[PDB]
Design a protein around this ligand. Structure first.
Ligand code: CA
Ligand code: CA
Ligand code: CA
Ligand code: CA
Ligand code: CA
Ligand code: CA
Ligand code: CA
Ligand code: CA
Ligand code: CA
Ligand code: CA
Ligand code: CA
Ligand code: CA
Lengths: 68, 148, 147, 45, 146
């Protein structure tokens, strides 16, 4: 006997190897997320401004560029 | 948002559930206070209302998911810009030698109030260290900031 | 020097960029969204003061007559170069004194302009006199104080 | 005012840290299971 | 002796084999699983599998019978002598340290094929003091836990 056991063992092994790959990928994803969440949080950490005419100057330049 | 992903919306929805305890689709001042107290804070009934008012766009007194999402999409800035990554790197790279050492990342995390064991920190480095030299350069950091 | 109808039209074009909802008035909220779209981050108090500086009848927002009054005045004053510098800062995102093709695209896009990558490179190329691939302040001035 | 937002960020930070600890525990369990079954199959020789 | 995790695992395995999910495993469902694994069993061989674990002789296999076989066959190999032996073999060169190469070698003689990076990961997890290798005490702890 003991032939069904070998089959089940083969099945479980495949499942276990899959569990390992999935666990590793889950870890990579969480770590990546922590790197990103830390970064953007870190960016928020860093410590008479009329802009109407400036905008106009830029639009005028674009106009002239198209007409050259 | 479209600038937002299906995965992000899923994350936000889960975040929303952390507040909408009874899952009735809305966050009340009571549910908000319950979470704030669990976090060691003691808000006055007034401060809770003020918090709700911050995002209660239809003015009905409570926060629904669309309102929650509007705030999150707005506040959660995606540091993808080459400019954003650069500045991000500089902070991590304390001595500006072009490499993020485990030691540097360590301080950064402990300072930010982040709760990570020195082992989890080493794990962060190892996962980012593409060429395996034992530290994280700018390019590797770039890959880490912009990946799957 | 007067105000041609064409000049007024160009000023109207700038006005419309800020009047997001097309209701004929620029509010603190609208100025806020345009400035943040151009890399800046003014506070509510700063936005209010900026609106107050242009709001002649004191109703809290800027209408075209008020906008035109301020724009025509600044155009007459040629002695100042702070306007050009202002335009420079809008492009210079990182503030490193150089305008990259990327920073130029960003502004173009946020100002409702859709030029091809062939035109963007065309612009940089033309304005980049010392051939370093980017536009510095001196180069920007020249590009702006010309056609 | 970002007060609500700051709260959400902390709640998510805590959850993420939990996710990491939980993922490491699962990885450790899987690896231990493999060491044991490998030795099991080994002595079975 | 059988942990909650083991019972759960074996139950899932039983379910996978019980294709129609009627609570019993037939020779045919057994054949399907084996062919999915690329095998080509005969009717006689399938019959033998059923007989090895069919306690009530009803012809099929229910969970209790499946579990009985698993509980017995999957018995923990953690006696002091068993651990000592496993360590002697893992540590191929007998220098007192199981290396990645040594483990990576055993994974072949058992067909337990894993990628080089996974083998390195197994070592790391067992390497408690972080000296890059697994000694006797570390191996013992890995074999006895849960
Ligand atoms: Ca609720
Ligand atoms: Ca509401
Ligand atoms: Ca450094
Ligand atoms: Ca590296
Ligand atoms: Ca308007
Ligand atoms: Ca007015
Ligand atoms: Ca620049
Ligand atoms: Ca240049
Ligand atoms: Ca069945
Ligand atoms: Ca039976
Ligand atoms: Ca050895
Ligand atoms: Ca060791």
């Amino acid at each position: 006997g003991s032939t069904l056991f070998a089959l089940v063992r083969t099945a479980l092994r495949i499942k276990t190897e899959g569990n390992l790959e999935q666990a590793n990928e889950e870890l990579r994803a969480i770590i990546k997320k922590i790197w990103k969440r830390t970064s953007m949080k870190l960016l928020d950490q860093v410590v008479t401004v009329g802009k109407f005419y400036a905008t106009f100057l830029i639009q005028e330049y674009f106009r002239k560029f198209k007409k050259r | 948002a479209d600038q937002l992903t299906e995965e992000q919306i899923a994350e936000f929805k889960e975040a929303f559930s952390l507040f909408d305890k009874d899952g009735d689709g809305t966050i009340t001042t009571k549910e908000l206070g319950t979470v704030m107290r669990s976090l060691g804070q003691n808000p006055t009934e007034a401060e809770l209302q003020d918090m709700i008012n911050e995002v209660d766009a239809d003015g009905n007194g409570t926060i629904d998911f669309p309102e929650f999402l509007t705030m999150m999409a707005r506040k959660m800035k995606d540091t993808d810009s080459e400019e954003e990554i650069r500045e991000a790197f500089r902070v991590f790279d304390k001595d500006g030698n072009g490499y993020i050492s485990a030691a540097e990342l360590r301080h950064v995390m402990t300072n930010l109030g982040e709760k990570l064991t020195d082992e989890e920190v080493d794990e962060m480095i190892r996962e980012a260290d593409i060429d395996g030299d034992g530290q994280v350069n700018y390019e590797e950091f770039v890959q880490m900031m912009t990946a799957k």
